[PDB]
Amino acid sequence: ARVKRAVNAHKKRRSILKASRGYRGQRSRLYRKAKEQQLHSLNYAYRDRRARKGEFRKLWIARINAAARLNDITYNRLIQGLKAAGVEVDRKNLADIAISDPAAFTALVDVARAALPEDVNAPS
């Protein structure tokens, strides 16, 4: 029972080339050079779903740091004073109050300044 190979083989060729639209050069026209980039494109994507949770935190910290130094406190002593007062707001929403509501960010900086100890360099 001789089996021609074309009907089976052309099912993985189409889904590679449909997922390779937008690529330039031979990486969107040819099957062999597009299967290689899909090895790279789906590895980088796995690499970057796990890395974008510390890119947004790297962006949320950089904006809280800017909104704290207008209310003359550092990012260093802001996280300390919020933990000492028992405020469990995450850094995503604390860097969105920093833009969308700058007057309620100051009312949080004034709580993180009161629960902070009297001499922050003294031994505890």
Partner RNA sequence: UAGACGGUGAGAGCCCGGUACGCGAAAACCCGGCACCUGCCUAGUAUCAAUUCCCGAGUAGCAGCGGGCCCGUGGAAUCCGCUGUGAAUCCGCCGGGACCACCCGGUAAGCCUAAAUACUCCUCGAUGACCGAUAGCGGAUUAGUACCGUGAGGGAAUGGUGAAAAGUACCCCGGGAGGGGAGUGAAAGAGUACCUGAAACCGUGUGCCUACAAUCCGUCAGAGCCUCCUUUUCCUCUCCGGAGGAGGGUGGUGAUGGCGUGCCUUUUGAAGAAUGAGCCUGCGAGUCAGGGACAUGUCGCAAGGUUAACCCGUGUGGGGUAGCCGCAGCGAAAGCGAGUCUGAAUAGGGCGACCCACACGCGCAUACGCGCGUGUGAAUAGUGGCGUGUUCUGGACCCGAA
Partner RNA sequence: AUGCCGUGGUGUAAAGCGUGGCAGUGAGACGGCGGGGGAUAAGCUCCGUACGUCGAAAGGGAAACAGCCCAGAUCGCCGGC
Partner RNA sequence: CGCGGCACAUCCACCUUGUGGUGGGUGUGGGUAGGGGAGCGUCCCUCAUUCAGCGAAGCCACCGGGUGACCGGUGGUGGA
Angle, helices 56-68/102-112, rounded to nearest 10 degrees: 80
How many Å apart are CA 8 and CA 18, to the nearest integer? Answer: 17
Instruction: Tell whether residue 22 is a contact of Mg ion (CB under 5 A).
Output: yes
69-98 positions binding RNA, by CB under 7 A:
79, 83, 90-92
| Smaller CB separation from RNA, 27 or 113 | 27
- Binding residues for RNA, rule: CB under 7 A, are 1-15, 18, 21-27, 29-33, 36-37, 39-41, 44-53, 55-57, 60, 79, 83, 90-92
